[PDB]
Write a protein that binds this ligand. Structure first.
Ligand SMILES: CC1(N)CCN(c2cnc(-c3cccc(Cl)c3Cl)c(N)n2)CC1
Length: 484
C-alpha cells in the first residue's frame, strides 16, 4: 500500500505526479482523504469522505477499505469520473517510512537496546535515526534462543544522495526497499550469525493497568494518528475473496454493493438462499453485519435462529440524516409477526435514555419447542457523525449486553449491526473483546489495541473505520479501568 503518502499536500502531490509520474499515475493522501490521479498531463483530485460508516468517493461507490477501493477501480476500469473516464494504472509509491511498524525514528541507541531486551524475541528489529552522524539510520535486530544465548546487533544504514545502503551491495531509494530486501535476503555475519528480520518490535502492547500513561503519551504531538495510520497500511494484507457477495443473485441482498463479507468467515445459511452480508467474529463470539434491507429481514432472522443468538446489538436509528440505515426487523411492543418460516413476538420494551431493550421471542412456524428469547439492545444516541464524547454510556451499554449474554446457557454469537456493519459495529465488538480480557485476567493483562483490530479486520472488511473510533477504543479501556 505504498500509493498512500501520509504527510503530503495537494501541491507536493501534483509535483510528484507531474515530475515522477505518467498518465494513469495516482496516489491517495490525507486532506476525509484525496485520490490524486494524472490524466492528459494534468492532475484530478477525487474527494473521499469517511465520517465512520464507510469511504464515500465523490462520483463513485462506497468501500470498506482504501486498498479495496484502489483494487476495485484498477480491475473495474471505466467506473471513475465531469464523469470523464479516469484511469488508476500506475501507483506512485511513497518512500516516507513514518507509517512502518519497525520505524521508531527518534529512538536512542540505548533506549532501543532496552526495548529489544525487555520486549524482543529472535528476529525483533526496528529502524531509528542515526545517534551521532545525522540523516543516516540504524537497523537494530535481536538474535538468539542473562545466559548470553541472545544478542542485539546494530547495522549502520547510510543515506547517500537519497539512497540507502548497509555499507555495501545494492542502493535502495527508500528504507522500506532496504528492509524488504534484507527480510527476504538476510545479512549473514562473520562466524555465521544470520541477522534475520522476522517481526518488527512490538511497542503497541501495554499492560492494562498503564492505559492512562499510554493514552497520555499518544495524546502528545498526535501518536494516535501515527499508530492508526500504521494500522491502515496493513489493510493490504487483508484483500481476501468476497466472491459469494458479488454473485448475481446476491447483489440485491447487499445494502452497499461493494461492502461484502469475506467468503472464509461469512454466515452460510442452511435449510433454505445461503447468503447474508454477515461475518463470524472470533477473538464470546460475534456476528458483524449490515442493517437489514426489506428483502433481507427473513434471512436476518434465519441467521439468528441458526446461530442460536439470544442477543442483538443495534447501534443505529432506522434513519439517520434523512437516509435509511436499517429496516424495522422487529414487531411493535406486544405484537406478533411472521418473517418467512420465522415467528417473532415482541414481549416487552424497556426504555433507558441511551438505548431500548426489546424482549423478543423467536421460533420456526409449526415447531413450538424451537422458541428462545432474543434480547435486542438498540443504542439510539450514537451521534450522526463521529463518536460519542463520553464513553460511560457505551460501556454501560456493553456491561448490560455482556451480563445478559453471560446469563443465558449455550448462547450463540452476539449479533452486532449498524448500517454497513464495519465502523460502529467494529468499534463496539473491539471495545467488547478488550474489556472482556480485563474482566477474565484482571488489570494485570497484556492488551494491544491494533493487534485486536487487525485480527477482527481479517474476519470482516474495514472493521474500525476512523481515527476518532480508534481513539474512542483507547478512551473506553481507560474509562473502564478508572471505574474499577
Ligand atoms: C512509531 C511507529 N512508526 C508507528 C507506531 N507503531 C506501530 C507499531 N505496530 C503497530 C501494529 C501492531 C500490531 C499489529 C499491526 Cl497490523 C500494527 Cl500496524 C502499529 N499500529 N503502530 C510503531 C512504529
Amino acid at each position: 500500500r505504498r500509493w498512500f503518502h501520509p504527510n503530503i499536500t495537494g501541491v507536493e502531490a501534483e509535483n510528484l505526479l507531474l515530475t515522477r509520474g505518467v498518465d494513469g499515475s495516482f496516489l491517495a493522501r490525507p486532506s476525509d482523504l484525496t485520490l490524486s490521479v494524472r490524466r492528459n498531463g494534468a492532475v484530478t483530485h477525487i474527494k473521499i469522505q469517511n465520517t465512520g460508516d464507510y469511504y464515500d468517493l465523490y462520483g463513485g461507490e462506497k468501500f470498506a477499505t482504501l486498498a479495496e477501493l484502489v483494487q476495485y477501480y484498477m480491475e473495474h476500469h471505466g467506473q471513475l469520473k465531469n464523469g470523464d473516464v479516469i484511469e488508476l494504472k500506475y501507483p506512485l509509491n511513497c518512500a516516507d517510512p513514518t507509517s512502518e511498524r519497525w520505524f521508531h525514528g527518534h529512538l536512542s541507541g540505548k533506549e532501543a537496546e532496552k526495548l529489544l531486551t525487555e520486549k524482543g524475541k529472535h528476529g525483533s528489529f526496528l529502524v531509528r535515526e542515526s545517534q551521532s552522524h545525522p540523516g543516516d539510520f540504524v537497523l537494530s535486530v535481536r538474535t538468539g534462543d542473562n545466559d548470553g544465548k541472545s544478542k542485539v546487533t546494530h547495522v549502520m544504514i547510510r543515506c547517500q544522495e537519497l539512497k540507502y545502503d548497509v555499507g555495501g551491495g545494492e542502493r535502495f531509494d527508500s528504507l522500506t526497499d532496504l528492509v524488504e530486501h534484507y527480510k527476504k535476503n538476510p545479512m549473514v555475519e562473520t562466524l555465521g550469525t544470520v541477522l534475520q528480520l522476522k517481526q518488527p518490535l512490538n511497542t503497541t502492547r501495554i499492560n492494562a493497568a498503564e492505559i492512562e500513561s499510554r493514552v497520555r503519551e499518544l495524546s502528545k504531538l498526535q501518536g494516535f494518528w501515527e499508530e492508526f495510520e500504521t494500522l491502515q497500511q496493513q489493510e493490504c494484507k487483508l484483500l481476501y475473496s468476497r466472491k459469494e457477495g458479488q454473485r448475481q443473485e446476491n447483489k440485491n441482498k447487499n445494502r452497499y454493493k461493494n461492502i461484502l463479507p469475506f467468503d472464509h468467515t461469512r454466515v452460510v445459511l442452511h435449510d433454505g438462499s445461503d447468503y447474508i452480508n454477515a461475518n463470524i467474529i472470533m477473538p464470546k463470539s460475534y456476528i458483524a453485519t449490515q442493517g437489514c434491507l426489506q428483502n433481507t429481514v427473513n434471512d436476518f432472522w434465519r441467521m439468528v435462529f441458526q446461530e442460536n443468538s439470544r442477543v442483538i446489538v443495534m447501534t443505529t436509528k432506522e434513519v439517520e440524516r434523512g437516509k435509511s440505515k436499517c429496516v424495522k426487523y422487529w414487531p411493535d411492543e406486544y405484537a406478533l409477526k411472521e418473517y418467512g418460516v420465522m415467528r417473532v413476538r415482541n414481549v416487552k420494551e424497556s426504555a433507558a435514555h441511551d438505548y431500548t431493550l426489546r424482549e423478543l421471542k423467536l421460533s420456526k412456524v409449526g415447531q413450538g419447542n424451537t422458541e428462545r428469547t432474543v434480547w435486542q439492545y438498540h443504542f439510539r444516541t450514537w451521534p450522526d457523525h463521529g463518536v460519542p464524547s463520553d464513553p460511560g454510556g457505551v460501556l454501560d451499554f456493553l456491561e448490560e449486553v455482556h451480563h445478559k449474554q453471560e446469563s443465558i446457557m449455550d448462547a450463540g454469537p452476539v449479533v452486532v449491526h449498524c448500517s454497513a456493519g464495519i465502523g460502529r459495529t467494529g468499534t463496539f465488538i473491539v471495545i467488547d473483546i478488550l474489556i472482556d480480557i480485563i474482566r477474565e485476567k484482571g488489570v494485570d493483562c497484556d492488551i494491544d489495541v491494533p493487534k485486536t483490530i487487525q485480527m477482527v479486520r481479517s474476519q470482516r472488511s474495514g472493521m474500525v473505520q476512523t481515527e476518532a473510533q480508534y481513539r474512542s477504543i483507547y478512551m473506553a479501556v481507560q474509562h473502564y479501568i478508572e471505574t474499577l
